[PDB]
Amino acid sequence: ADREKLLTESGVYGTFATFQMDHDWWDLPGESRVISVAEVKGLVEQWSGKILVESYLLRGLSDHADLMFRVHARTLSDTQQFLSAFMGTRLGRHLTSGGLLHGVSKKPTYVAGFPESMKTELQVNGESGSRPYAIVIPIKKDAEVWALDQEARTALMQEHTQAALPYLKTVKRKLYHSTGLDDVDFITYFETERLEDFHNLVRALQQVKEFRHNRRFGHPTLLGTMSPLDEILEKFAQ
Amino acid sequence: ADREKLLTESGVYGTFATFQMDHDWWDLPGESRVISVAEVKGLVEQWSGKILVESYLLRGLSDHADLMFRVHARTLSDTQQFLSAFMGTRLGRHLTSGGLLHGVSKKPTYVAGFPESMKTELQVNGESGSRPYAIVIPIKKDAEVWALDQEARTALMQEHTQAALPYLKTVKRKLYHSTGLDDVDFITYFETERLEDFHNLVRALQQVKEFRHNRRFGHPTLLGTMSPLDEILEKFAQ
Amino acid sequence: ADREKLLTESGVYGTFATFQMDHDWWDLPGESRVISVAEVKGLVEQWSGKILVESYLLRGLSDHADLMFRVHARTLSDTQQFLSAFMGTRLGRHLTSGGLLHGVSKKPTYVAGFPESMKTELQVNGESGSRPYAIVIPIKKDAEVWALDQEARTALMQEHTQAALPYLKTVKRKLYHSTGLDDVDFITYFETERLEDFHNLVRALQQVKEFRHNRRFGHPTLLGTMSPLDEILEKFAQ
Amino acid sequence: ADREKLLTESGVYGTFATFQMDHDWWDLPGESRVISVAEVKGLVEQWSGKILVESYLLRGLSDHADLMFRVHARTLSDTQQFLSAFMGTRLGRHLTSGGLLHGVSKKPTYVAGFPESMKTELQVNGESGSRPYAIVIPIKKDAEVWALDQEARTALMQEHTQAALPYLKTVKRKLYHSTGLDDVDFITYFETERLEDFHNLVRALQQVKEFRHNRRFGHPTLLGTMSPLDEILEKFAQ
Amino acid sequence: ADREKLLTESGVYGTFATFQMDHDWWDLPGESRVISVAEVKGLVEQWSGKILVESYLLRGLSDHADLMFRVHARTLSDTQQFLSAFMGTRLGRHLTSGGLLHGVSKKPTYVAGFPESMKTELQVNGESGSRPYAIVIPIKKDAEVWALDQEARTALMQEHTQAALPYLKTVKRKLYHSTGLDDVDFITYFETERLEDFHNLVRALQQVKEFRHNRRFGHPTLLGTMSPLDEILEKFAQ
Ligand code: HEM
């Protein structure tokens, strides 16, 4: 019900937590593991009131990463308590943190200066799909960029948006403002059913001016499949 | 009593030590951990005469980090003695050092050359708050910066303060001069109850001239919650 | 049967998975290992319907890497499901992931602008050989490159083809377009029976203009021997 | 007999493999160590037909390295099989691979354009010595260098050779061409009885123009003592 | 007796060895540990003819480092044997190698071209003190520096010496020429009783031209306390 309430509002913190599994985890009986999976499910259900948790399977698509959480919360204190509780489960005890990124969702600052045709088209964001591919790309801008004026940056983002137009429906997008909460300026997140499309999207965006100013682009580039927490957890219990 | 002499005086060394918990710590009985946690509590109280020790929960906010200490001492040999004992406890035996940074506090070198109105406001530094967020950011400047004359750097630093003024109350700050004691020139430390404020603070500072001259900014950016040592250790002993 | 249709078609995903073996793997009886190798072979034929899996021996030629897979699939979900199961085997359980790269094969975009003499020559691609050396070289182009026009980029690739012509026969080649699926823009793959030929090819390509615009070239440079799954597995069961 | 044929011919592959000893090696009885040592001692004798293996003591001179092999072979498949067999022994089982580099020996490409005086002096290469120091320095040249024409590059190498002339006898030298076989362009190898001579040589070579064009110089720089395999392993069985 | 001859003479090698203590060292009875302490003491006493061994406590001041040796020898092979022998002791069995650097002492090469006041002032080097702080800073110069002539570098080094004059007495200094023996050109070593003094020294040196030409400055900067081997080991025999 309130899953759409956090996924759209401004001032909401999004956290991306990556985890890897110790090898001696498979040296455990399938029954100890089945119990450990139930513990995790109960915990997220317990937190289903304060925070929203979506889970992704990174195992086999991203190196040194088996699982990712995307946590939405009004305060990172909530995220901290939940993540700390998660790593405390018997499943969590066997997990190695492989990355942690935070960012807050905001209302667009440049869209207001775009052509109205571009504004209205931007009201489209992805399309209905089951178990889509998900990509997360952390971004650090070089310092020279922040010297530019509001008009110039508005221009760069329109050039940016213009190249991305063909993918409004076929590629869902989300942006998190991350500067000061970690070592990057932005966290970018995308959903898609066709990876060949997303590839062309990033390839198209490489042709604009804005792209020349990335100190960090990827590193890591997280690639996974969006899946119910149930299905992912099952894969760890055989 | 003298807890405030260390947090405010000049010539006081601040050391930041971050720790990650080994997985085989969870292979220990809750009985041994409660005993091991008791060991650490006594040690800091034992050292409660010469140095000040503050603990932070980094687990769930920073990757590869569960705990951080901020230790203040008049001589770094004392800090050395304390940490060496801490890492010797059974809790310490299972901890992986994730970084160790030192810096000394000083009297401002540029503030004297600021406008007097700006001087007086700088006398404001944070506000009363309970269990605040804490951010630690190591900073390395590129070499050309040190070539500039004192007047130019005063100008850079004034532009720096000018952008930071709106956050004097909502963001407490402290600076440690670290060059020669490790691989960074400064350690920056901040407390806040509002991360979105601290975020906006760094965004404002990214727009000034001095910012263009950072060889290293972050790496790591430490984010945690300030908490009594008791509560932190508690979380690891169940 | 249809294995060359994937190795040649466009819209086919190529994934490169590298593995190192844990030391505690050899503390197992030679009897258990053979059983575990048995576990792996059944899996590849079980997936031999949905995906193509080729295996390479990297042990002794590449540092910190013992095994590599080259998986071709219609969808990366298939690769993920296979790989997630593979690392789940009792053999995989003792394997440390050393890298994962994805890329899609496409029809040439620049060749159409080549001389007819050069185009026809390009239809030659490697030659018949047994258990050839294999090389994988990930590539990231710098951002300034993507600003150039189609004509300029066409010229650079013609000059590129021109220098590589002598190796059409002695060096099999394949290119994967990877941008957005990981931290590189291209994955290049080669088969050859004479490493000094492939060497002369790469020193020759270093002489061209296009070569100066590689932010990342190698890292890692993967060198291994192409072998049936049967022969490689032998080496971990001794 | 053919011991000098491999160390002098062109078309010979030189591979450098460094190893470190695990701590759990000492948790074995002194007889278990002697059995593992005899196994390795025996294994090299077995490969003494196809390839030449020279052993170096890096323990105490290079960090995270106790042993280095220098293997010469007409084909790298032999080297792979040998190293893969070595890493399989119970001694090797306790070993951590610390680096692996390949390169081919060639006949000089620039010397032909040198003064007859330089050619004749270059016929000097080292001197008679027992258990000499050995240094390995991997080199990556930057892309601009390969853009240069053959005449200009010949001049750079002459200026290069000229500074090196005083050390022809007291420092043995060998060059391996490595491009495409790994992430570096050259592998350099040296023997000497007086390290301060070799030091002065490297300082002397730092003064020429060509030196400014190394993207990578060292990393790692390997320092060890040339010693029979016999004495090296002996040191591990007490 | 000759302890002062080695610490001052030219042609003497200084080696810096870092060690970290294994966790399983504390799982031994305090009595078993004491024998190892006598074992090492006996070992150093045995080498007291050929080499000088000084010990430092890095634990609690340097990250990933508990102990450091500074070994002086007329030949580097002897250092190899002692270190190779030392890491073999039951103390050595529990020690983890953490870094290794070598360098040779020389007669000053630039000082002769200084003003005589600067020459005479330079004969001051530290002061009598017990258990001083010690700092080690590895240095790699960028290639352009070595292109400069003897006169120009003399000018650079004078400017360097000039900024350092205030610290002649309060900071002892020593310089090792390291090129070719590892990945750095120089190893710098300092003793001081006042770290804030050494800090001000490095801040002062950052302002001269020479500082801008460091490819590598620090990484790591080692910080520890000079202490007798006996007292340090006792701390490990508790
Ligand atoms: C796929 C469809 C996309 C659309 C329609 C789109 C459009 C936009 C728009 C309108 C903004 C302005 C935000 C604002 O005004 O507050 C923006 C910002 C941004 N986008 Fe995209 N974008 C797309 C894809 C991407 C991709 C693939 C990336 C990176 C891989 C990306 C990275 C960014 C970044 C870093 C910003 C913030 C730039 C800044 O504040 O300087 N976007 N995008």
Ligand code: HEM
């Ligand atoms: C309310 C927030 C802040 C205020 C009011 C403030 C103000 C100042 C002032 C007045 C100085 C000069 C001190 C002197 O003259 O010795 C200074 C120094 C410095 N500040 Fe801040 N600052 C704030 C936050 C930050 C933040 C968030 C960072 C980095 C993330 C930062 C980085 C630095 C550094 C590295 C120096 C020393 C630079 C040098 O000495 O060359 N400051 N700050």
Ligand code: HEM
């Ligand atoms: C006999 C050997 C080779 C031949 C004949 C050859 C030829 C070609 C041709 C015809 C293309 C056209 C691509 C297109 O039209 O879309 C191409 C693209 C490309 N090749 Fe090669 N190549 C060879 C080896 C290599 C090697 C060794 C590398 C790198 C180590 C490499 C890197 C690339 C890259 C990155 C592209 C695409 C770059 C871009 O689209 O901007 N090639 N090559």
Ligand code: HEM
């Ligand atoms: C007595 C000492 C030395 C002598 C006599 C010497 C001489 C030479 C000669 C004659 C060549 C020409 C090779 C050719 O024409 O194919 C050469 C190339 C080369 N040397 Fe040395 N050298 C010495 C020391 C060193 C050292 C210490 C290094 C590095 C640490 C080094 C690195 C190289 C490299 C990388 C090349 C090939 C570069 C290229 O082909 O672009 N040399 N040297």
Ligand code: HEM
């Ligand atoms: C009181 C303290 C210091 C004094 C009096 C001093 C003075 C000098 C002098 C006179 C030289 C000339 C050596 C020669 O002629 O061969 C020298 C060399 C050098 N110094 Fe210092 N220095 C001090 C501290 C430092 C520090 C703290 C560093 C780095 C952290 C440093 C880095 C170097 C390096 C790398 C060289 C060798 C450069 C070369 O040979 O080209 N010095 N120093």
